[PDB]
């Protein structure tokens, strides 16, 4: 998958 | 999947 | 799936 | 699915 | 499905 | 389905 | 279905 | 609000 | 709000 | 908010 | 917020 | 926030 | 935030 | 933040 | 997968 | 932050 | 995988 | 930070 967390 | 969390 | 959380 | 939460 | 919550 | 909640 | 709640 | 869609 | 979609 | 999508 | 997508 | 995607 | 993607 | 991706 | 955490 | 990717 | 943590 | 990639 593709994940960005901020 | 594709996930962005802010 | 595709998910954006803010 | 497609989900946006704000 | 498609969901937007605000 | 399609859902928008505000 | 299609649902909008405000 | 409170919403359930099925 | 509170939302469940299925 | 609180959101569950399925 | 709190979000679960499936 | 708290997010789980599956 | 807290994020789990699968 | 805390992130787990699988 | 692809993951960015900030 | 804390990150695990698999 | 590809991972960037900041 | 703390990172594990597999």
From Swiss-Prot, chains A, B, C, D, E, F, G, H, I, J, K, L, M, N, O, P, Q, R:
ADP-ribosylated. The ADP-ribosylation is retained in the virion during infection. It is found in: Virion; Host cytoplasm; Secreted; Host extracellular space. Packages the positive strand viral genome RNA into a helical ribonucleocapsid (RNP) and plays a fundamental role during virion assembly through its interactions with the viral genome and membrane protein M. Plays an important role in enhancing the efficiency of subgenomic viral RNA transcription as well as viral replication. Attenuates the stress granules formation by reducing host G3BP1 access to host mRNAs under stress conditions. May block host chemokine function in vivo, facilitating viral replication and transmission. Acts by being secreted into the extracellular space where it competes to host chemokines for binding to host glycosaminoglycans (GAG). Homodimer, homotetramer, homooligomer with RNA. Both monomeric and oligomeric forms interact with RNA. Interacts with protein M. Interacts with protein E. Interacts with NSP3; this interaction serves to tether the genome to the newly translated replicase-transcriptase complex at a very early stage of infection. Interacts with host NLRP3 and ABHD8; these interactions disrupt the association between NLRP3 and ABHD8, increasing NLRP3 stability, ultimately leading to increased inflammasome activation. Belongs to the betacoronavirus nucleocapsid protein family. This is Nucleoprotein. It comes from Severe acute respiratory syndrome coronavirus 2 (2019-nCoV).
